[PDB]
A paper describes a structure:
Lenacapavir (LEN) is a long-acting, highly potent HIV-1 capsid (CA) inhibitor. The evolution of viral variants under the genetic pressure of LEN identified Q67H, N74D, and Q67H/N74D CA substitutions as the main resistance associated mutations (RAMs). Here, we determined high-resolution structures of CA hexamers containing these RAMs in the absence and presence of LEN. High-resolution co-crystal structures of LEN in a complex with cross-linked CA hexamers revealed that the inhibitor binds in a hydrophobic pocket formed by two adjacent CA subunits.
Both of the changes introduced by the Q67H and N74D substitutions in the inhibitor-binding pocket were also evident in the CA(Q67H/N74D) structures. Asp74 interacts with Lys70 in unliganded CA(Q67H/N74D) but not in the CA(N74D) structure. The CA(Q67H/N74D) and CA(Q67H/N74D) + LEN structures reveal combined effects seen with the two individual substitutions, in which a conformational switch with the Q67H change and the electrostatic repulsions due to the N74D substitution collectively make the inhibitor-binding pocket less amenable to LEN. Accordingly, the Q67H/N74D substitutions reduced LEN binding affinity to CA hexamers by ~150-fold compared to that of its WT counterpart, whereas individual N74D (~20-fold) and Q67H (~6-fold) changes exhibited lesser effects.
Residue numbers in the entry:
A (entry chain C), B (entry chain C), C (entry chain C), D (entry chain C), E (entry chain C), F (entry chain C): 1 to 219
Write the structure that this text describes.
Amino acid sequence: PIVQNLQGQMVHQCISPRTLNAWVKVVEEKAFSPEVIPMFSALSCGATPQDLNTMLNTVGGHQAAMHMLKETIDEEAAEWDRLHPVHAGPIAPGQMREPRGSDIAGTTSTLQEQIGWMTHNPPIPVGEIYKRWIILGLNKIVRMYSPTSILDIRQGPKEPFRDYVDRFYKTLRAEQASQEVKNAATETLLVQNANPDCKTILKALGPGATLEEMMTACQ
Amino acid sequence: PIVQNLQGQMVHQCISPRTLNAWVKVVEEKAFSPEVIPMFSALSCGATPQDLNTMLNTVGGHQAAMHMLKETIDEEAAEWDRLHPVHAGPIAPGQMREPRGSDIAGTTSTLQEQIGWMTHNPPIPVGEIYKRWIILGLNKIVRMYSPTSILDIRQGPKEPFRDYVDRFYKTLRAEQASQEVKNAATETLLVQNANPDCKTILKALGPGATLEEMMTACQ
Amino acid sequence: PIVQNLQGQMVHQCISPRTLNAWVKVVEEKAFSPEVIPMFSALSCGATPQDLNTMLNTVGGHQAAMHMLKETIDEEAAEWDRLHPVHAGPIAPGQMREPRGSDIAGTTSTLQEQIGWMTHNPPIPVGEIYKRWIILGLNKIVRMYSPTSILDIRQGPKEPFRDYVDRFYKTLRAEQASQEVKNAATETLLVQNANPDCKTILKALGPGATLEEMMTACQ
Amino acid sequence: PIVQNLQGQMVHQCISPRTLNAWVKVVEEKAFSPEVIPMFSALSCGATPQDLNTMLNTVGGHQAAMHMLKETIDEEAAEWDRLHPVHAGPIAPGQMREPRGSDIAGTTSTLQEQIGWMTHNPPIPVGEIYKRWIILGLNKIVRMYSPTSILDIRQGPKEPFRDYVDRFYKTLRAEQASQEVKNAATETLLVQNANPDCKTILKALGPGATLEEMMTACQ
Amino acid sequence: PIVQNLQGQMVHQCISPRTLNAWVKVVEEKAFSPEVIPMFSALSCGATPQDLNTMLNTVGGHQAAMHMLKETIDEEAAEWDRLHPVHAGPIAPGQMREPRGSDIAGTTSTLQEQIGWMTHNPPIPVGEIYKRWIILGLNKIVRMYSPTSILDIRQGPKEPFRDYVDRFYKTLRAEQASQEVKNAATETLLVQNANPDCKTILKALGPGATLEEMMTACQ
Amino acid sequence: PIVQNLQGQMVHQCISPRTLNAWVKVVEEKAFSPEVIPMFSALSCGATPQDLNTMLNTVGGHQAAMHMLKETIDEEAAEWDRLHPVHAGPIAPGQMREPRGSDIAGTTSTLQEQIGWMTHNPPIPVGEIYKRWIILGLNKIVRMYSPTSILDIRQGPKEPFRDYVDRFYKTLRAEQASQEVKNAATETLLVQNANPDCKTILKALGPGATLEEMMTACQ
Ligand SMILES: [Cl-]
Ligand SMILES: [Cl-]
Ligand SMILES: [Cl-]
Ligand SMILES: [Cl-]
Ligand SMILES: [Cl-]
Ligand SMILES: [Cl-]
Ligand SMILES: [Cl-]
Ligand SMILES: [Cl-]
Ligand SMILES: [Cl-]
Ligand SMILES: [Cl-]
Ligand SMILES: [Cl-]
Ligand SMILES: [Cl-]
Ligand SMILES: [Cl-]
Ligand SMILES: [Cl-]
Ligand SMILES: [Cl-]
Ligand SMILES: [Cl-]
Ligand SMILES: [Cl-]
Ligand SMILES: [Cl-]
Ligand SMILES: [Cl-]
Ligand SMILES: [Cl-]
Ligand SMILES: [Cl-]
Ligand SMILES: [Cl-]
Ligand SMILES: [Cl-]
Ligand SMILES: [Cl-]
Ligand SMILES: [Cl-]
Ligand SMILES: [Cl-]
Ligand SMILES: [Cl-]
Ligand SMILES: [Cl-]
Ligand SMILES: [Cl-]
Ligand SMILES: [Cl-]
């Protein structure tokens, strides 16, 4: 990654074996669960496009998802080239060439060029731009591999309300619905999909009840 | 986190894989036991709002609690906006804009802005302010998930007084009662809920006896 | 902890996940064995009062001992206030306020104030003062939880003298007797509690024999 | 490796025990799977030719592949000598001698000479040149040890399309075919080798369908 | 330990949790085998007397040996006081007081005083002096706990000569005999204690044969 | 080891617990396999003679080999003294005394003297000179403990050619034959010791075939 050393200058460091192993293990253990994406974003803190390609390519298996990830990366790279056409001309002695879509993806750019963009003033954060493309493609993989729909998450007649809400927002997180549909899930599906005994209690609670108040009422 | 390097300047460092893994493991092993909160506060030492959101979002499962945590965060963010209304106007070339409630929660603020507030002179510690909101919501989760009331912790007729006091303050810690009710628990419930043999000995001890004196007397 | 960086200035560092995990594990594995106290003192090297409270509060269970530890801390804090009454008045622009007993315990003082005392010239080592209070309370827990008295440690008729001396000083260490009673344990109880065959040999050795000479004679 | 320290100067560091152990373990666990090559490239970040020879020589077993790796290294070293014949003459007091093919492979060059080339201005990156030779030979080992041909990867009549695509691109990755043959694998073999039910659905999808659209259609 | 930082000045660092755990584990696993002593010397590199007492006191059990270690430390401390009687008088503003025997053992000296002696110019290496006393006492424990004498290590009639020499020098190492008795062990006891078949071959080899030549001859 | 810090000056660092443990473990797991020697050379990067003696002495067991290692060290030390007789005379205030053979082995030299030679200008690399002696003795141990001769490595009638070549160069590596005998092993013994079916195919391949071509032909 490109990290600021203990002197105030942005320099390159090699990706650590701890970072490499941590990313491989979480994919082996959790696959494409929703919480893997924030783990990927944190383990790739300050990562160059080369570091991002390293983390992706060190993953063995799940190649169906890894190839869906490449298509999303190519789609975003093509959109970047449509919005940022590179202007031909010799690069000034102290400047950097404009990055193409494949340059941000680390496939047509060298590490020195990636360091040059990320450490420029003002900097071109090709690592963070590439990471946005990767996380976008990873989120589509999480939704595709989500097995259960939120409509099928219903509380059992003897299931504790706490365990049911655990399954509810676990499923809703993988579905990655819109903000409007997710915010009202507390007042709509969570009450509708509860068992008759708890739904009766939640009805007498009235609208605008917090999740803490709803879980307390059905305990 | 924002850490002072070995030169006296506050700079940003990426959250370490050791920190990321340590927080995920303690939640997998201890869930929301009371001692998880001081572990979260220590692992998030100097953490930015982005680091705090990272630690929370890397947690898979327990989504009922994680969503109760979001509501507490939104409640505190709304209270911050009520007490600190942002004043409109162009930001001076060397100053920072006033953070909104969602800016402290890391949802509407960039890392550069969070670094700008935390490294300002005087600094706006949005990371520590956000951590106060998170710990507040985490403490409410510990109380809700506390299974046993302190009134039901009674010493068995053959249970050693040491094991009974272990269960007593373990339950009392999760209940997180007031300081007045918790301080007098030594002289009130701890003696009342003891078995007849030890309660007789603790009665002859008289008021004002230390826990060391009470445990010694019933050994 | 407050550590001297690689430039000669005392600055604050966050407590490491390795330090946090090491202290939690040794309590889970060894509880309050005598050797846990030097491990606590080493793991808390240069620790601030906040770091000390962190290590104590991350311990789940053993709450009977942890509450006995709080009473010892409060007793020492009250003794500190009796010997150091804070003088009222505005603090000079470059000075620090006098710490109260609860300030050294980290309950009424901020981290910045603890850094201010520990890095002062001359420094007020509130971390080492607090650690003395904690170790004092921890030593009382080791004695209370010591199951066997030194008077009951006797060598078996067929027990090797080496194993008996292992049990002897293991028990004596947890008892934490006075220096006078512990120094003469070599010449008094260790010989008296040996089996008849080894006691006969140790009698012919004469007074002033080293433990190496006594163990060799009964081999 | 040759790493830039926290002062802006390229200096040598010893290869860490974490790096040494991580490379030995991944070979013990994954042998010559395709994802081992990006792991080798990352673990050898900034590595000198001596570090590269160290990582290769610490591998016990797989000596058939390790000897095939030596022949590829010798072939590339001979090609380097054909394109870069060293010019005889005394080296200037501040310059470096031209590296031979065996000098880049670390067999006829000292560490000081490798540091001299890598830290030169302009630098001769003998470590990255050697790594290109090693990765080239490692890729030939991956293809040779690939057990299954892509033509034999066909979807079962009841096999889910997701698992079939997992096996498809896993096999195709080890085959390491040309870019033209690999890019069209989505529109050609992946549909041809699917079961009759999914092939019918993929036919009605039409050409130019993304892998995300194809996997969704056969779910 | 007192380590030279990355600026050329000798400063104090806290003993690491890795060092603390490594010393406790090797004692739990190997007890007082001969190879534990060089491990103790390496783990205590640059250690202060406080660090040395920390490592010794973190050891639970083996208290018979740990108390024999204290007597050896007191014997050496008394010998130091006999050779270095402290001269009374006020210490100059830039000097250090002469260390007593108990000051080197870390029992009557503070860490600041130990840092003052070790970082003095010229330095008083109280840590290395104390370590010599500890290693001296540890070596006496290794000899006492050595179960087998070198005279009883004889090669079996069917035992391979390699395994017999393994047992020979393993026993001889724990005995820690004199240099004269240990150097000639190759030409004396190693041949005398071999089986009749190998002793016949070693006799025809003649004097002055290396261990490599002796092991080859009896293979 | 003597490592260049982050300021361009060669200073001493204590050998890390990770380095100490890594060397002990690889000897416990792999003994004296050929790949242990490059692991020893890497773990001892920049090691002083004291660090080298530390790594050797921390090895418990295998004392037959460890004593054969001492004789090789003494042989090389005697050869060093024969080629470098120390010249008597007082050492200049800024110079270092000439190292004897036992000084390079770390037995008659202090750490300060070893630092003085290694950090001299020009430096006397006593650590690398000692390491050459150790690796020389370690290689003789690998050959002695090699159980199988290369002449006895023959391909089974149903053994895959890949597994046979694995056993071939594994045995040849431990034998550590000459370069001339090892280079022609591809064209001589590897074909001669193959089964009749593969030997027939390798005969029709003709001379000068690469190992990749030979393994492909017998697959
Ligand atoms: Cl690492
Ligand atoms: Cl995987
Ligand atoms: Cl994310
Ligand atoms: Cl450019
Ligand atoms: Cl609940
Ligand atoms: Cl880490
Ligand atoms: Cl979890
Ligand atoms: Cl807390
Ligand atoms: Cl701003
Ligand atoms: Cl008790
Ligand atoms: Cl850590
Ligand atoms: Cl515990
Ligand atoms: Cl202590
Ligand atoms: Cl103040
Ligand atoms: Cl004994
Ligand atoms: Cl390491
Ligand atoms: Cl292997
Ligand atoms: Cl690669
Ligand atoms: Cl040169
Ligand atoms: Cl799917
Ligand atoms: Cl550590
Ligand atoms: Cl132990
Ligand atoms: Cl030693
Ligand atoms: Cl003094
Ligand atoms: Cl042998
Ligand atoms: Cl370490
Ligand atoms: Cl071993
Ligand atoms: Cl080597
Ligand atoms: Cl000298
Ligand atoms: Cl093959």
